[PDB]
């Protein structure tokens, strides 16, 4: 491996490269300044990011001796053996030449010395502390660590002289660079565009890209060997990569019908900050984040959220309202914090909170254990949405069918500033057209007549009618005919009543008057 085999982690890679190589390339500089260089690095990030690859690349680029120590491997049940293993490893590393020690997964062998109960763990922790710092501890040898959760480590280990430097190894350009470097040794094709790959694989850590490329290359030969100069004109195409991706929703601005102004507003407010950061920096202002949808159920709020999430390269984390509450003390707030930490850990990201009426509930006062739980959940949500944060890129999108039961602290501007109302036959025509995109249609059917007889149906009702028509067509087979629609139209539901429509109209009128 080499420095050219690393992409995306440009700044941290450069920092580690200089801090490791400057002592090695020439120690005269540090002799002149009269200060010893740092001799420890704690890498942290999700698994499969390239941290051990970076350590190996640095060790290869320099005259070092990469020695790998695994966490679970060195720990044993025998008394006074794991400590002997660590001592032997350090003696070996220091014996031959100035080297790099990469001890992987230290969190398994650093349980904070308070939450642990096994004496071997504390003993190996103390051995590590003595080896890293003490009388003639280290003589021209550096240690590198790796973990997923850096919090579960001894404070004594995160000190200067042991792990004085902490590096965060967590984007589009880095992903494209990894795609380029992972396909350098194979002639794939002439019409394969990497922009779609860098935009579609928006949730890949970086070690999954190698697996994706290998899988596509293997499947290309798997599909090109059933029947079989053969070596000529070999390589992967777009189809193989698409199949590899198939082996996180499938919508693009088409499955939604009507609501043109709402579509345009969402598209602008979501795409402007992502496409033009330079313009906002020039204007020196942040973008709006929050949007709330309210109206009758089954209107397409989830569909709209998916459709505005898909065009950008952002992730999508959808969570139901009551899908987080727990009977325990502090579990719901822990779940909320984990959700938001994940959301802001992969920027950009759009979070779709469904059924806010279940979470917010207009806390007020209830005088009960459920009341206290709701109060704590609401306060945690308020702090996470707008509190002591950085708000790099997070787009919280709300969706409820009873906005009257929401406290006026989440509807506040800066959290859910946009109060969008989601409410016709012309719209129903577009809905039917978008639903019947890939279907064998009859020239004799008139969708206008079908839409004319709705008079207050929802998109769920239209999908139900389409499903009944498809069931009738499959029953006949075992194109869609008009009599299936004729017989399916009589069995309408119209699940949405009239009083709730009056309530929504009153709420919209009050909001407009406000």
């Amino acid at each position: 491996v080499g420095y050219d085999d690393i992409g995306g982690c440009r700044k941290q890679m450069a920092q580690i490269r200089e801090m490791v190589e400057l002592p090695l390339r020439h120690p005269q500089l540090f002799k002149a300044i009269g200060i010893k260089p740092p001799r420890g690095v704690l890498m942290y990030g999700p698994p499969g990011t390239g941290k051990t690859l970076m350590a190996r690349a640095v060790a290869n680029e320099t005259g070092a001796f990469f020695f790998l120590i695994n966490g679970p491997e060195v720990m044993s049940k025998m008394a006074g053996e794991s400590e002997s293993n660590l001592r032997k490893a350090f003696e070996e590393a220091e014996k031959n030449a100035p080297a790099i020690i990469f001890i992987d997964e230290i969190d398994s062998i650093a349980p904070k010395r308070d939450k642990t109960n096994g004496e071997v763990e504390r003993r190996v922790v103390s051995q590590l502390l003595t080896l890293m710092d003490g009388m003639k501890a280290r003589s021209n040898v550096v240690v590198i660590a790796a973990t997923n959760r850096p919090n579960s480590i001894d404070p004594a280990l995160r000190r200067f002289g042991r792990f004085d430097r902490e590096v965060d190894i967590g984007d589009a350009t880095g992903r494209l660079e990894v795609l380029r470097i992972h396909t350098k040794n194979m002639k794939l094709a002439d019409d394969v565009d990497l922009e779609a790959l860098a935009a579609e694989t928006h949730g890949y850590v970086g070690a999954d890209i190698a697996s994706l490329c290998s899988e596509a290359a293997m499947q290309q030969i798997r599909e090109k060997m059933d029947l079989i100069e053969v070596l000529d004109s070999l390589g992967v195409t777009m189809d193989n990569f698409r199949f590899a991706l198939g082996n996180s929703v499938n919508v693009t601005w088409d499955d939604v019908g009507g609501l043109d102004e709402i579509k345009e507003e969402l598209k602008e407010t979501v795409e402007y900050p992502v496409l033009h950061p330079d313009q906002y920096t020039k204007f020196g202002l942040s973008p709006s984040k929050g949007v709330l949808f309210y109206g009758p159920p089954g209107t397409g709020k989830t569909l709209l959220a998916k459709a505005v999430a898909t065009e950008v390269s952002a992730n999508f984390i959808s969570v139901k309202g009551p899908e987080l509450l727990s009977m325990w003390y502090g579990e719901s707030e822990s779940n909320i914090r984990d959700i938001f930490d994940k959301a802001r850990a992969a920027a950009p990201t759009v979070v779709f909170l469904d059924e806010l009426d279940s979470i917010a509930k207009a806390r007020g006062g209830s005088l009960g254990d459920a009341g206290g739980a709701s109060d704590r959940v609401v306060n945690q949500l308020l702090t996470e949405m707008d509190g002591m944060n950085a708000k790099k890129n997070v787009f919280v999108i709300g969706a409820t069918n009873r906005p009257d039961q929401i406290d006026p602290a989440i509807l506040r501007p800066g959290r859910l500033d946009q109060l969008i109302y989601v409410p016709d036959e012309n719209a129903r025509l577009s809905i039917l057209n978008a639903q019947l995109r890939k279907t064998p249609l009859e020239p004799g059917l008139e969708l206008t007549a079908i839409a004319k007889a709705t008079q207050g149906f929802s998109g769920a009702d239209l999908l139900y009618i389409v499903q009944r028509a498809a069931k009738y067509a499959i029953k006949d087979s075992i194109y869609i005919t008009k009599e299936h629609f004729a017989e399916a139209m009589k069995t309408a539901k119209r699940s949405v009543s009239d009083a709730e429509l009056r309530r929504y109209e009153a709420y919209s009128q009050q909001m407009k008057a406000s």
């Binding site: 049940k77 008394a79 006074g80 053996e81 325990w328 003390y329 254990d369 206290g372 739980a373």
Partner: peptide
Amino acid sequence: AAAAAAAAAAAAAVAVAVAVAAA
């Protein structure tokens, strides 16, 4: 002639924890 040696290192125990329910 050969010789034997004794060795007794450790074992593994199980703990019990208490939880709090918020109804």
